[PDB]
Design a binder for these strands. Sequence first.
RNA 1: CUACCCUUGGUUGUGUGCUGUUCUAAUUGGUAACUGUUAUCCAGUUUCAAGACAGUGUUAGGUGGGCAGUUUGACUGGGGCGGUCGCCUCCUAAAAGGUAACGGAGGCGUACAAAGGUACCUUCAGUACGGUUGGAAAUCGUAUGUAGAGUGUAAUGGUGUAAGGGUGCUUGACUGUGAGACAUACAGGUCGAACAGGUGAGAAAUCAGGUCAUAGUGAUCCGGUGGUCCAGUAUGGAAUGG
RNA 2: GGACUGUUUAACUAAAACACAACUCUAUGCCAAACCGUAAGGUGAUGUAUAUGGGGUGACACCUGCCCAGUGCUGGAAGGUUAAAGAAGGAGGUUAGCGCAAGCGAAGCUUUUAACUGAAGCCCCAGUGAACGGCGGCCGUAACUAUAACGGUCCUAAGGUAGCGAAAUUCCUAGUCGGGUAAAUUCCGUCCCGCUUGAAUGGUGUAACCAUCUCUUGACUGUCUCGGCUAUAGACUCGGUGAAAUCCAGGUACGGGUGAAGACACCCGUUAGGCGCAACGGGACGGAAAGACCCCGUGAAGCUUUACUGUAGCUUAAUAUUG
RNA 3: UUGUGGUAGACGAGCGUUGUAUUGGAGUUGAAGUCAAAGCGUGAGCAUUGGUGGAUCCAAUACAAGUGAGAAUGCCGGCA
RNA 4: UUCUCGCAGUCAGACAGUGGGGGAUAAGCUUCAUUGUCAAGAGGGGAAGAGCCCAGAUCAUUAAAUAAGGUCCCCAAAAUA
RNA 5: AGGGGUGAAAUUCCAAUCGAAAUCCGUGAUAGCUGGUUCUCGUCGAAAUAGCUUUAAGGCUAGCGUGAGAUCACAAAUAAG
RNA 6: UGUCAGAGCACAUUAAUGUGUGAUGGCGUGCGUUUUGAAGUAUGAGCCGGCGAGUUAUGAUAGCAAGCGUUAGUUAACCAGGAGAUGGGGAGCUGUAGCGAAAGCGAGUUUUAAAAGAGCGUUUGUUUGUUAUUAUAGACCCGAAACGGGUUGAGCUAGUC
RNA 7: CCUGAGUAGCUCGGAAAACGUUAUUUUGAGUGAAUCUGCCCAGACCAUUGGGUAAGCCUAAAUACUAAUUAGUGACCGAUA
RNA 8: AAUAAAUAGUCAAUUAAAGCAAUACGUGGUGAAGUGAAACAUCUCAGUAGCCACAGGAAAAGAAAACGAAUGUGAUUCCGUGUGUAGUGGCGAGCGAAAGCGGAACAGGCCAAACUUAUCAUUAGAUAGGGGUUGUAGGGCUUGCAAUGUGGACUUGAAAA
Lengths: 50, 59, 99
Amino acid sequence: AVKRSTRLGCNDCREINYLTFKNVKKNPEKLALNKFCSRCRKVVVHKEVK
Amino acid sequence: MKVKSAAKKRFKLTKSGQIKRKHAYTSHLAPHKTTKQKRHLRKQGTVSASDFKRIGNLI
Amino acid sequence: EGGQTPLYRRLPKFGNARKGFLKQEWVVLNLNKIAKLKLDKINRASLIEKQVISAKSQLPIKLIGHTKLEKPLHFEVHKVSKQALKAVENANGSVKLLE
RNA sequence: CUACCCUUGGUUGUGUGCUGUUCUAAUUGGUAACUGUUAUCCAGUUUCAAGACAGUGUUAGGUGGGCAGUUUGACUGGGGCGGUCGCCUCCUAAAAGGUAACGGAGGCGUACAAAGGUACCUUCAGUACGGUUGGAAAUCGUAUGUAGAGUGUAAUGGUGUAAGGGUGCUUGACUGUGAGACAUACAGGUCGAACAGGUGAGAAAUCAGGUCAUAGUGAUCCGGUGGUCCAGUAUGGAAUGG
RNA sequence: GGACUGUUUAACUAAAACACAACUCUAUGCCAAACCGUAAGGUGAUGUAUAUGGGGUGACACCUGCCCAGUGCUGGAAGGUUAAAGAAGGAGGUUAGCGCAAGCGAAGCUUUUAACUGAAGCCCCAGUGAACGGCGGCCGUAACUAUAACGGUCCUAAGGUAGCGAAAUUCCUAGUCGGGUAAAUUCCGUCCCGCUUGAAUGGUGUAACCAUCUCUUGACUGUCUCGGCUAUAGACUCGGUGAAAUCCAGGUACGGGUGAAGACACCCGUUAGGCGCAACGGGACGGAAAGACCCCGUGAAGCUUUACUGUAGCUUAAUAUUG
RNA sequence: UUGUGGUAGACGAGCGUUGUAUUGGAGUUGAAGUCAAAGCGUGAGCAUUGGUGGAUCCAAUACAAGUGAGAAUGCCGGCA
RNA sequence: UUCUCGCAGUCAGACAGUGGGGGAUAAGCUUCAUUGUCAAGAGGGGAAGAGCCCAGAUCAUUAAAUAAGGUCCCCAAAAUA
RNA sequence: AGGGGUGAAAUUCCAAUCGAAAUCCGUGAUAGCUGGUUCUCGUCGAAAUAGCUUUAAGGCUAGCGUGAGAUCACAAAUAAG
RNA sequence: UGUCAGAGCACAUUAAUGUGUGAUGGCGUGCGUUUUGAAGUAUGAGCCGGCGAGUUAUGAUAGCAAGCGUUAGUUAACCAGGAGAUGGGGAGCUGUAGCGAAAGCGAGUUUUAAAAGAGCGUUUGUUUGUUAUUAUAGACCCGAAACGGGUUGAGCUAGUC
RNA sequence: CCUGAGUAGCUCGGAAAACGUUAUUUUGAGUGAAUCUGCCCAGACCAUUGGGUAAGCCUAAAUACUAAUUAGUGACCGAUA
RNA sequence: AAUAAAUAGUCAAUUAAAGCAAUACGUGGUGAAGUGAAACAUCUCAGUAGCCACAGGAAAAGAAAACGAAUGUGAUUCCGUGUGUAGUGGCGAGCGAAAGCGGAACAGGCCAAACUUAUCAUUAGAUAGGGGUUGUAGGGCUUGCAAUGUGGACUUGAAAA
């Protein structure tokens, strides 16, 4: 099975928030994106976790 | 008679029947599932009328 | 099931935090039901005479039910619901919490 | 100079087993002698031989069909090797849907911060005409061409300013849901108005809860990781459990 | 073919089998190995390496070609790898106390396995094939030549050496050839590219011998040509006695068609007085034998094994014996 | 009015026998059992009579069945 | 022919027609869908025939109209051109 | 003396029988496979299809039949459009 | 292998279109069995007589009836007695509030910031009697090759002394 | 001054415990405390607290059971039982 | 005896069976298989079948270092509730408590220990006497008082029924 999806947690409240599909070859760089956080109840910068 | 120990660990009983069951497929991979499926499988349900004939006789 | 996997081993199992722990029971006094009861100046001594609770037993008492009544009485309970507490205090009844 | 922390050696010493010495003073004997006894069994003494070994008790290892208990799926115009067991696309399938075949045709055990979205701009392939190297074929200018182009891909299709290309901006590729439908024996799988909050794209109305779509995935037991407003066997914690 | 005399499945098969003297290999130094039993103990054996035990080939004569690739065994120790167990050490809890909180945190218990030590053994290196066993291709070239005497190439550890070679082995095949035979898919010797021969899981000659097999030959005969008669015991009759398998019930014909596809019972046409006896048995898909031939059963049983898991036995380390 | 094909199978209503228990009766002036004959029944059954027969039954009601025989290569026994 | 409840039963179907596929538009063959039958329901025609045709049987009739189908005889049942 | 003995070896023999004797018990082992299963009557009265299955002889669910209740015409069919 | 009839014959009864019997006419290929199915050349059954295979103990569910009936019903056990009902006996249970993993809360809970929207709640019954079914008990009757344990056989063969 | 030492216990394998090794209890092997100021236990454990001080023994009573005797009974079977 | 003593040993006297079965129960040791799980290696079966040893009128067990979390009882034993509970389990098959209560049924005592007396050579580490059978701590030592006191779990006779 191919496994290249990645979990996305938070850099402030620090829990896994989402799971996305990002290429580990054409752009394996960090993606500190903006998503909704319920524990913050606002748009927060979520960070990919290996 | 005795109550099935294995069975009773997975079904609750509510008022006026309506045996509450659990939801499976929570084991391995979220990416194999969609957001609606993940947010709906958390809710628990009750066996059907056809299933009820196989649940009432079970206990 | 004729070769099909049994239903219990196809679904997850419950988890009980009260494992190895037996929850303390609570005799609940719902206002709608105890309205049928004619007892006044309620205490554990009177309740056992009416067999609402076993005489050779004592259990903590909880108050329950927002169904308003129309008589002031004396309540000696251990637990109480907020809406039930409001219902029994507005009915001019006196309630003393026991512990 | 009053000293300390590191590299290392010499360096007196106390403890630990490792080999190399004897020794029986453990021990054994299927050495011999004597007594019970007239008893080659046995017991006792002495001697002899090793000997703190072997050996036994336990623990932990390796060889170990020598031995023991079990196993070795189904389908198949009968047995058997063949091929398959899951999922998706076309015909079969007879114009609702759907319908079998060990019938006729192919694939999947995915790809992508763009190939999602937003706002804006833009329109074929092929063919033809004319042009340096340069032609059959490099490309441009124009005409023509109904899209046979292209759509991340297997087939189905649709896709003629689109479902495709270019530019800029974010990653709604939202949180909690959800009336309601689909399909169905269960499990499940499909869509989902609309709501609360928060955003993103665009001034905008509107759109965004992934890709034009359908394959693209394994329940459950058990186990691990983080958090938890959960419990803490009398209590207090903790372990541990949820 | 086997050396032989012999043993063999009681009650199908008496041998090309097995055994067999002999040959070869291997282990065992004594309280021997081995074997049995839990263990004393016992055979071996009250033997003592010319004895016992195993493995294989099985008169006698001549040989046993190559290869240690992999395996098994033996030997070797460096190298890596290796348990239980010991503790170098680390972390955490409860809380005395210190602490404004937060937190730090002595001692007791607490919990955890990591430095290092840890054998035997495995990986590693050699020998052992009369130890398992295995022991090739491509191209050019021989008065064609497919052949293969030969020369180059590739692969392997080596590529069956000798011997034999339609054989108990040869599918083709009834191979060819000569003899045999008027005429012989059998037989005798030969031809050597031999599907899949082959040297102790042995090979060739091999004297004699086989209730051994096969072919030919002199004689020999009712085996046959070609069958028949004599006497009995039956078969037949008489007197006595007298059971069995089978058995839904029957008064139980023919041909065609039909059928669950092979009709005494069906329909159509035919014929047959009834009952017997003697032969002989077409049929009643005759009889006993709930298929046993083949298949299935999430059947059983046994057997083999790098199928799994255990485990006897053997071996190694620790610990008490044990200084 | 529909009506009265039907396996599996569903549903409903009844009958037979024994015993217990209460109310009855008969019976050496013959009970049961058995055989027979020329009855009644939708059927489980009910009779009637003749004689063997030589001392037990039947009728009405509930309760409970070692309760209802066409096969089981059915068990035994008897018989061809 | 809706739902619930109780009890089920069946998956080894076959035949005929239609449209087929495979096999050969060979097979009383297989696979299918559809229309009827037997299974689970007899009867008449069909020479006797489970699946063809007519047809769906409470029972008694020595009553009538008939369906398919038939009318020389077996064997009820017509003749004219 | 029987997961034993014996065996010039053949799976030989071990009381006319033996891939391992017989006897009693666990055990009434198990039998998706065979066989059978004993009074009357009335009414209704299918399926041999689908999915799943260490699964094709089996078993589970559906659909179906039947019985009780309700719905009782908006439901369901039959014709016409 | 008999039916529907029926000549004739001999009779005369549970007196009735009677019985027995049938020269002859029409018609007609057994019973269970399992299969899609057998007159079947598919199997079983010779016949006869008895016998011969869905019970029980407990518990639950469903139906019908009853008692009680909105904190009632009901006793397990135990005791008094005729081997008896009965009485004494409330030990406990069910229904009388559920939600949430639980803490906790509760005519609301949980998800959630939100009772937003959704889940359930927002309330009936108890115990016996009959029948049926299911569950534990071998649990309609019968049929395996099988495994272990406890024992006896070497008198038959074999082996040796 | 004393109150039951190879004792409690710790470890290696165990077993009983509903428990398939988990508090607790027992030991085949190793090891091995304190002296009521102490220990055990309050299902790991730790502190406080609670309770009792193992490491000696005995114990009618309700308890299973009839081989039988005595008297009696059987909604027991009646020679196929 | 070898060995002086000494043991081993030899003989003599006394005492318990040794043995049978109640074809029923108990304990302890030992200890299966088929089977179910649709198969099977966990497990179930089952600590059961079976064997042994000992019996007894029953056996085992029994006085809290018992439990266990309560103003909790204060030997043990048995039934029921607790409940098919919590849990345990290829967390599968399956197994399954325990407190608490209602009852059936009551019996509490006895040795070492501390210290002490006497007798053995008092290397006592030997024997016989008070002591006293514990945690609500006690016993031992000593100084005092009050008493003979019930009880049996208990000996002989006598009487009665």
